[PDB]
RNA sequence: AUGGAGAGUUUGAUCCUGGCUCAGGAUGAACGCUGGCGGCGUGCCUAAUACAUGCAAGUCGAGCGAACGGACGAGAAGCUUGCUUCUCUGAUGUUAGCGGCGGACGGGUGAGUAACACGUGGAUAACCUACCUAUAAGACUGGGAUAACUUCGGGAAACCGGAGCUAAUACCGGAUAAUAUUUUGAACCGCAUGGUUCAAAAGUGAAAGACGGUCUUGCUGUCACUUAUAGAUGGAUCCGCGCUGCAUUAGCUAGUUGGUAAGGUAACGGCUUACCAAGGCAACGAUGCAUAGCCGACCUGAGAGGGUGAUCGGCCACACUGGAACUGAGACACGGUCCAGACUCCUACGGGAGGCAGCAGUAGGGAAUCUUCCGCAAUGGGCGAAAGCCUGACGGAGCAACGCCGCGUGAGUGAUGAAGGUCUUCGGAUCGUAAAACUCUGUUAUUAGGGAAGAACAUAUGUGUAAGUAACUGUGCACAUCUUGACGGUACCUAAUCAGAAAGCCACGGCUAACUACGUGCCAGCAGCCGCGGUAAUACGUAGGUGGCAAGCGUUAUCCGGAAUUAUUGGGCGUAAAGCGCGCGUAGGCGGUUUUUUAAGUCUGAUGUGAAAGCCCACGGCUCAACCGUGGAGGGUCAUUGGAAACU
RNA sequence: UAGGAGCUAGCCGUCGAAGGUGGGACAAAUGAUUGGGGUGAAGUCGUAACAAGGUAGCCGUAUCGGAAGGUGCGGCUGGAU
């Protein structure tokens, strides 16, 4: 996947949601060597590529994972720009970041692959498994606490829309699927659909 | 070639091991602004090794990736 | 049961009991949809030299009584 | 590396065809003479078939000949009878 | 003769048999006479026996034979147990 | 009607027209460089080139001769009191025959074949069918041989040449009934002809074993056996249509063309033979040439669709070549026979042999495409009740990123300058909240212990029931007792483990997001079109940033979209390419106007209704998924069917 | 006896694959030498055509000249006076 450190990633792309923010220290125009110059844009074909780059780098997958969901967005006959996102919002990638199981997603997306998260029962090793809404997104009882697991539950409450949670060993429910209004405007989801049109 | 057709094939790269009678491999790929010759010579494949002193075009011209 | 009982109209009765009726219909180019007339003579055995010139002969297929004789006679209408 | 069946079959079909050229040749003996002696209204003009229709069904009672060939035999035999 | 067999499906090291009553002169995955039902005995518990026993009344009465493994799931599931009275005609 | 934009390119500068070029997909791809692990497919595309070796179809003492070994009572003792040294009771096994089945299956290949071959729709009043299942006729008689054993010979050889012998459920003669059969009359369609009783010379089976218990056998269970029906199987024959191109292939055939009589085939006839007329076949391109197994299927197209076949299925053809037959129900037979040919091999030189397109392997050629692998555990088939053998089918392992899906190459900090150069009209932000210096997690990985499904289905393990049986095994049918597993202790689970050991590549000119210095002097060289380098190159070559995206990146070649440059949909013919020099005219195509018949063409309605991975919609199985099933949809295209006449 | 009939054998003529040549036909490869074409350099000479390009074109045709061109006869403007 991505496997980086997001401290320069808030300044590199459009946005990538590192933490509270990382651009205010140095000059936030560009990271370096050519930025404060004749500032050139790119095309709308490249803007939808850049709007793809504000969501491919945000969700952290590769292509044909951000791209093979797009043809099943052609199976769901709603708005193609946002019904793509609601199936993209219906997986285990929303768990390892948003509900706080680390100070990031990387230490917690490690924690599912050990078999130390164990959603829906015994074990789901993979985060590409779509969280089919209704299954009890649980936590392994042999990994209850760390320096990261229960810590950011106290920091970040409001496990998002149509995914509830608990402190009962930090288990959720994921009661339904959230809509496009439960999809942030940090990257405009409508402007990915035409780079994949081209 | 194998089928005994005589060509004029462009030898890309700078240095070579192509004095005579080298049992070589030949691609397509025309070099423009050069009449008749419209074939390349695969560097570093059959009986030549590729050229040495390249550091921006390293995958081509027979150079293995450094370290 | 029966056998196939197609129709026709003679072209040339060969010597000693071989009439040759003419069938023609309209096939199309499926790329174009435009149909066009086309012909396919199916040669019938005349049992007793029944059919004549002009006759719109309805015949009936059989198993081969000879090399060409695949069809036998049922219906003859007119003559010129 | 021919297996023992191929060396066994060639000899049992040597002797089975020797049993097949026993009776079929004896039938093709019978269709050479009892065919030639039933005709022209001989001494046994209607009794020669009691060996002919005997033996052409002796070929039919075993695997020597097709039964329709035995039917083909009586077609030209009993037309003369 | 014509006989019931085990024609399989499924990915690597995992069979999905749909049964077929057809001739022995065909290969095991060849062209068939009748694909009656399926049989997936390889599960954790079940043999998953789906059977439309209406046509065993035809074929076993005029030429088809059960053969040594397709015979005794019929004696297990009870397909030929219904045929036991249907052969008792 | 979920698709249909493109980028450039003729100038000193425009519009048209035109091809050409790239952007985008895919490949059995292969190559340069790279390379974590699983879960998955595919795997000489060339030489249908040639082959060493292994090695791949068998089957049954419950057929019966043999003969061998031989348990088996096995004397007297060979007195070494232990063997059989003898005899017969001699089983089982071996043989190796005779015997019935199989050999046409599984497996492999696309040369031939442009065709009924295949596909698809029909048809046989021209159809066959061992075995299997059901239906009835029933199993009478005699029987020589005959290998085996003895005997003679050859040759190191190989394997034979001769003399006498031996059993059968093998085999052959005698009569037995049948819709047999050609002679006499009553059914309808398809002229011929059929249809099912008719009624007659007819016609001949025949196999007997191990055995439940009985009867020193009887229904013969077993498993056959031969007589008259069927069910089935696969195959045959006959007409529709889909089926490459060349007239710089036009005149094609002469047993040909129709018929006339014999064949003979499961049937048909020019199929051949004696007869009759030249006829028949043709520019709608017969004829011939060249090329190619066909279809499903793949694939991209808005649809109009048409290109691939490694795939993966169905059919056809082939088995060193070319002929001829045998046997068998089924062959003109891939590990049968004979002939002829060409190649190869052994030899003691006398004559002997062999046909990898069955599975690996070898050489060859090629750019290249799997281990002289394992096990039959599952399935499936073969003969046998079964057990057993054969599986080089199959189920697995190997090897390959060649390709598909996840997995990786791992984090909260803290200097925007700790040590650091693609620049400086250096002062600097800086690679760079990069990082030393730490919190922490252990996908994989290290490595030491449980372990698994599949692996369930039999025959083995009696009571029975059903056809029941003289009674009972037997056979179909309930148990509940017990069988074995290539993969594999592999996968999986536990713990321990270090933040462990892991991405590469092309430009940074404009297309197109990713730039700057050293050489460099139209040189080296890049080069998709326009083009860079002549001493100030952002373009070359040298090096930091980034960028596109990840175990790939790039090149090469190959089909499609982009592209309506084949334009039915959806192209032009005055000057751009498109009218002969004009005609006249043969064929052909296409024709003014107005009424009525059919329902042919049109368009509809009742169904059957169109193919398996491919294809509509929704689930199930896969950790996701890769990858396999479900439910209708179902054809809405073709057939069986009713119709309607303006317009043809 | 094995004589007839048949059979093994014996001859006797019809058709045969392959062969053997035989003539050709067709196809491919090669051939001392050659003659048209393309690309480059255009090394060279001339300046034909484009300006009524110094003495308008163009077609069919015909002849000469190595070629460019020269002329001639019908037709066309896609030409100046």
Concise synopsis of the structure shown:
Chain A: Part of the 30S ribosomal subunit. Contacts protein S5. The interaction surface between S4 and S5 is involved in control of translational fidelity. This is part of a larger assembly, with chains A (198 residues), B (67 residues), C (80 residues), D (81 residues) and E (89 residues). With 67 residues, chain B is mostly loops.
SSE diagram, text form:
This is part of a larger assembly, with chains A (198 residues), B (67 residues), C (80 residues), D (81 residues) and E (89 residues).
Chain B (H helix, E strand, L loop, with lengths): L67
Chain C lengths: L23 E5 L6 E5 L4 E2 L12 E4 L9 E5 L5
Parallel strand pairs in C: 3-5
Antiparallel strand pairs in C: 1-2, 4-5
Chain D lengths: L3 H35 L10 H10 L8 H14 L1
Helix pairs in contact in D: 1-2, 2-3
Chain E binds 2 RNA strands through β1, β2, α2 and α3.
PDB class: ribosome
Keywords: Ribosome, antibiotics, resistance, Staphylococcus aureus, exit tunnel, RNA, rProteins, erythromycin
Entry title: Erythromycin Resistant Staphylococcus aureus 70S ribosome (delta R88 A89 uL22) in complex with erythromycin.
Describe it.
This is part of a larger assembly, with chains A (198 residues), B (67 residues), C (80 residues), D (81 residues) and E (89 residues). Chain B has 67 residues and is low in regular secondary structure. Chain B contains no helices and no strands. The N and C termini of chain B lie far apart (36 Å). Chain D is mainly alpha-helical. The longest helix of chain D is centred in the N-terminal third of the chain and has 35 residues, at 4-38. Chain D starts with a helix and ends with a helix. Chain E has a 3-stranded antiparallel sheet with strand order 1-2-3, with no helix packed on it. The chains hardly touch. Chain E binds 2 RNA strands through strand 1, strand 2, helix 2 and helix 3.
Quaternary state reads part of a larger assembly
Radius of gyration of chain B: 13 Å
Percent strand of chain B: under 5%
Calculate Rg of chain C over CA atoms. Answer: 14 Å
Characterize the overall form of chain C.
globular
String of helices and strands of chain C? EEEEE
| Class computed from helices, strands and strand pairing of chain B | little secondary structure
Biggest pleated sheet of chain B? none
Distance between the termini of chain C: 34 Å
Helix count from the secondary structure assignment of chain C: 0
Sheet of most strands of chain C: 3 strands, mixed
Helix amount of chain C: under 10%
Strand arrangement within the widest β-sheet of chain C reads: 3-5-4
Shape of chain B: globular
Classify the helix fraction of chain B into a percent range.
Answer: under 10%
The total count of helices of chain B amounts to: 0
The helix/strand class of chain C is mainly beta
| Overall strand count of chain B | 0
Strand content of chain C: 25-35%
Topology, number of strands of chain C:
5
Cα end-to-end separation of chain B: 36 Å
PDB class: ribosome
Keywords: Ribosome, resistance, Staphylococcus aureus, exit tunnel, RNA, rProteins, erythromycin
Entry title: Erythromycin Resistant Staphylococcus aureus 70S ribosome (delta R88 A89 uL22) in complex with erythromycin.
Chain A: 30S ribosomal protein S4
């Amino acid at each position: 996947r991505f496997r980086g450190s997001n401290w320069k990633k808030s300044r590199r792309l459009g946005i990538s949601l590192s933490g509270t923010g990382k651009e205010l220290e140095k000059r936030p125009y560009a990271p370096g060597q050519h930025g404060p110059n004749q500032r050139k844009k790119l095309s709308e074909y490249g803007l939808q590529l850049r709007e793809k780059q504000k969501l491919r780098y945000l969700y952290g997958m590769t292509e044909r994972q951000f791209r093979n969901t797009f043809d099943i967005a052609g199976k769901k006959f709603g708005v193609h720009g946002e019904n793509f996102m609601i199936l993209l919002a219906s997986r285990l990638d929303a768990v390892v970041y948003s509900l706080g199981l680390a100070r990031t997603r990387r230490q917690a997306r490690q924690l599912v692959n050990h078999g130390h998260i164990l959603v829906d029962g015994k074990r789901v090793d993979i985060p590409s498994y779509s969280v089919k809404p209704g299954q009890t997104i649980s936590v392994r009882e042999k990994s209850q606490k760390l320096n990261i697991i229960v810590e950011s539950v106290e920091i970040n409450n409001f496990v998002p829309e149509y995914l509830n949670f608990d402190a009962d060993s930090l288990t959720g429910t994921f009661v339904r699927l959230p809509e496009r209004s439960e999809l942030p405007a940090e990257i405009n989801e409508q402007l990915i659909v035409e780079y994949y049109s081209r | 070639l194998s089928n005994n057709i005589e060509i004029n094939a462009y030898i890309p790269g700078i240095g070579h091991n192509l004095q005579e009678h080298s049992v070589v491999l030949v691609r397509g790929g025309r070099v423009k602004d050069l009449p008749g010759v419209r074939y390349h010579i695969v560097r570093g494949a059959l009986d030549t090794s590729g050229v040495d002193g390249r550091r921006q075009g390293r995958s081509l011209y027979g150079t293995k990736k450094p370290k | 049961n029966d056998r196939k009982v197609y129709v026709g109209k003679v072209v040339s009765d060969k010597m000693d009991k071989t009439i040759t009726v003419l069938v023609e219909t309209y096939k199309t180019h499926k790329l174009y949809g435009k149909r066009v007339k086309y012909s396919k003579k199916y040669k019938t055995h005349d049992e007793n030299n029944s059919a004549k010139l002009g006759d719109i002969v309805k015949i009936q297929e059989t198993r081969p009584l000879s090399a060409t004789k695949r069809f036998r006679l049922v219906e003859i209408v007119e003559e010129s | 590396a021919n297996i023992k069946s191929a060396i066994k079959r060639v000899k049992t079909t040597e002797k089975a065809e020797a049993r097949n050229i026993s009776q079929k040749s004896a039938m093709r003996t019978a269709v050479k003479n009892a065919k030639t002696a039933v005709s022209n209204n001989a001494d046994n003009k209607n009794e020669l078939v009691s060996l002919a229709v005997k033996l052409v069904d002796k070929a039919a009672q075993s695997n020597l000949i097709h039964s329709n060939k035995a039917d083909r035999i009586k077609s030209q035999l009993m037309t003369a009878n | 003769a014509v006989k019931i067999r085990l024609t399989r499906l499924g990915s690597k090291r995992n069979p999905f048999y749909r049964i077929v009553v057809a001739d022995a002169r065909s290969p095991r995955d060849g062209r068939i006479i009748e694909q009656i039902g399926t049989y997936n005995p390889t599960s954790a518990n079940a043999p998953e026996i789906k059977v439309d026993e209406a046509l065993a009344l035809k074929w076993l009465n005029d030429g088809a034979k059960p053969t040594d493994t397709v015979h005794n799931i019929l004696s297990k599931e009870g397909i030929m147990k219904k045929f036991d009275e249907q052969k008792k005609a």
